């Protein structure tokens, strides 16, 4: 069979469609540009007592981004980390 060996998710190669019989030289250097799109999320909290489920507001994940930071008052620096806001609830099965 044609058994799979390896798979890459991350951007590497870029297939270009100009026309049949293109003349593209070696000296020509190409630049790729991925569009910024903050993806959606799901969260599931669990133990032997309670369940914690939540999703993300699509419209919010396109309009305003959320980010957490640690700040030293005595220094004046901000260690920022991009984080999504998951509106979760509590249950128990």
């Amino acid at each position: 069979s044609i058994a799979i060996d390896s798979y890459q998710e991350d951007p590497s190669v870029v297939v270009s469609n100009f026309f049949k019989g293109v003349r593209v030289p070696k000296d020509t250097e190409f630049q790729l540009y991925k569009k910024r799109k903050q993806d959606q999320f799901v969260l599931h909290g669990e133990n032997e007592r309670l369940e914690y489920d939540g999703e993300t507001d699509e419209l919010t994940t396109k309009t305003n981004q959320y980010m957490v930071g640690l700040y030293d008052k005595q220094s004046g620096k901000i260690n920022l980390y991009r984080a999504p806001v998951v509106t979760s609830k509590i249950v128990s099965k």
Binding site: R36, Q38, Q40, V42, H44, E46, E51, T61, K62, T63, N64, Q65, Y66, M67, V68, G69, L70, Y71, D72, K73, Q74, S75, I78, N79, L80, Y81, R82, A83, V85
Partner: protein, 111 residues
């Protein structure tokens, strides 16, 4: 539990430090900033930590700073909790004694 049809499990998450968190030196900020801004490109965030309504100059863009915490309206955030893994996919609510927010901000364009 099993997640939905097109949602794939987060396995290689980035470790958020929690030693530098709870400190007799540090804080814990939140930023409800518009999606339009590339926060990767940002070199500095010079704002006012002791005023309610103010203006941030980020590059060439003049945004309206609103401190959420210093408005006694939404004074307290016991609603929002921070998660952290202790293994990188095993996110857990950050520990101190339970960590709640201090300074929280929203920056807007020219309405």
């Amino acid at each position: 539990y099993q997640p939905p049809s097109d949602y794939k499990q987060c396995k290689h998450l980035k470790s958020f430090p929690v030693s530098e968190l709870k400190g007799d030196n540090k804080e814990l900020w939140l930023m409800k900033v518009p999606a339009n801004i590339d926060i990767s490109q940002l070199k500095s965030l010079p704002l006012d930590t002791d005023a309610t309504v103010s203006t941030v100059e980020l590059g060439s863009k003049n945004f309206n700073v609103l401190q959420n915490t210093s408005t006694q309206e939404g004074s307290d955030n016991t609603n929002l909790s921070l998660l952290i893994p202790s293994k990188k996919e095993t996110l857990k609510v950050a520990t101190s004694k339970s960590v709640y927010f201090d300074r929280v901000f929203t920056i807007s364009e020219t309405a």
